[PDB]
Amino acid sequence: GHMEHRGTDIISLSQAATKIHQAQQTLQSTPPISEENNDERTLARQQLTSSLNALAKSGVSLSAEQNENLRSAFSAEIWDMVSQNISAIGDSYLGVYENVVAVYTDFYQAFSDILSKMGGWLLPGKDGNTVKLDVTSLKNDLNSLVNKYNQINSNTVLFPAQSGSGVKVATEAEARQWLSELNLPNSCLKSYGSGYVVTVDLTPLQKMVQDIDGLGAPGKDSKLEMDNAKYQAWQSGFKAQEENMKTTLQTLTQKYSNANSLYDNLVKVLSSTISSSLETAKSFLQ
Numbered sequence: 117g118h119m120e121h122r123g124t125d126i127i128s129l130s131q132a133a134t135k136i137h138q139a140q141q142t143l144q145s146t147p148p149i150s151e152e153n154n155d156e157r158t159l160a161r162q163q164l165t166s167s168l169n170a171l172a173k174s175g176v177s178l179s180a181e182q183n184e185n186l187r188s189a190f191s192a193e194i195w196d197m198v199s200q201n202i203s204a205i206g207d208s209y210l211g212v213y214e215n216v217v218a219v220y221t222d223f224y225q226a227f228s229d230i231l232s233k234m235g236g237w238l239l240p241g242k243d244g245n246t247v248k249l250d251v252t253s254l255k256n257d258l259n260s261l262v263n264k265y266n267q268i269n270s271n272t273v274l275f276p277a278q279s280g281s282g283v284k285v286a287t288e289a290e291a292r293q294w295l296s297e298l299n300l301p302n303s304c305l306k307s308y309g310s311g312y313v314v315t316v317d318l319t320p321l322q323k324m325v326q327d328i329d330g331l332g333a334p335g336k337d338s339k340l341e342m343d344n345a346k347y348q349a350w351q352s353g354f355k356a357q358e359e360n361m362k363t364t365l366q367t368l369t370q371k372y373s374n375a376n377s378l379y380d381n382l383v384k385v386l387s388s389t390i391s392s393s394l395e396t397a398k399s400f401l402q
């Protein structure tokens with residue numbers, strides 16, 4: 117125990133610092149908006165975990181204070197506990213949030229694509245005080261989106277994260293915990309086979325379709341002639357529902373960001389611990 121090995125400690129600590137910094141760069145730069153991006157993020161966390169596994173085996177020494185920092189933050193042996201703890205947070209918390217954003221991203225794009233058609237569904241009325249709305253084309257497109265995202269598959273499931281040809285499901289209790297965590301309405305909790313899933317919120321779309329039927333029966337052309345005031349009042353209601361979906365997506369992306377920030381704060385604790393150890397290896401008390 118009397119012979120030092122600063123050279124090898126410097127190499128081992130440097131190696132770990134580098135891998136941790138690379139994983140951090142990935143997790144701060146790569147948005148969780150596609151399967152491909154999330155694969156990159158998951159790989160970055162694997163690279164971090166592996167680096168801590170290697171560091172644990174390297175025999176670098178921790179001071180009492182560094183030891184304590186690690187125990188406190190993550191509540192050879194110490195590094196294995198740290199690796200286990202951060203791995204759980206990455207897989208079970210951050211990785212679920214990443215799936216939530218990617219799934220919602222594509223859903224919301226599908227909605228955006230319908231909004232892009234609305235211009236063509238609003239025509240001149242019989243005179244300057246009236247309009248003609250293609251209520252049939254609009255309702256059909258919304259109902260189609262509802263139908264698509266009312267299914268249970270990888271396009272629709274927020275939790276659990278999906279992969280392979282089955283449907284991964286959770287216990288009701290675990291699913292409700294995520295429902296609460298995500299601040300989603302109760303309609304998002306769905307039974308599937310032996311368990312439960314959490315899916316996208318269709319309620320504003322369904323409300324839109326209801327308000328369309330509320331305007332009254334279309335004419336012979338499947339379109340609805342409307343006085344300007346009535347159209348304006350309907351448009352206000354439609355926008356309100358668009359706002360609801362926008363708000364939902366916003367909550368979810370902010371919560372993802374905070375999950376990513378929580379993981380990053382742990383990474384900072386790692387980097388600071390390793391940096392302090394590197395100073396120790398380089399320092400000579402006179």
Ligand code: NI
Nearest residue numbers: 117118119120
């Ligand atoms: Ni010795």
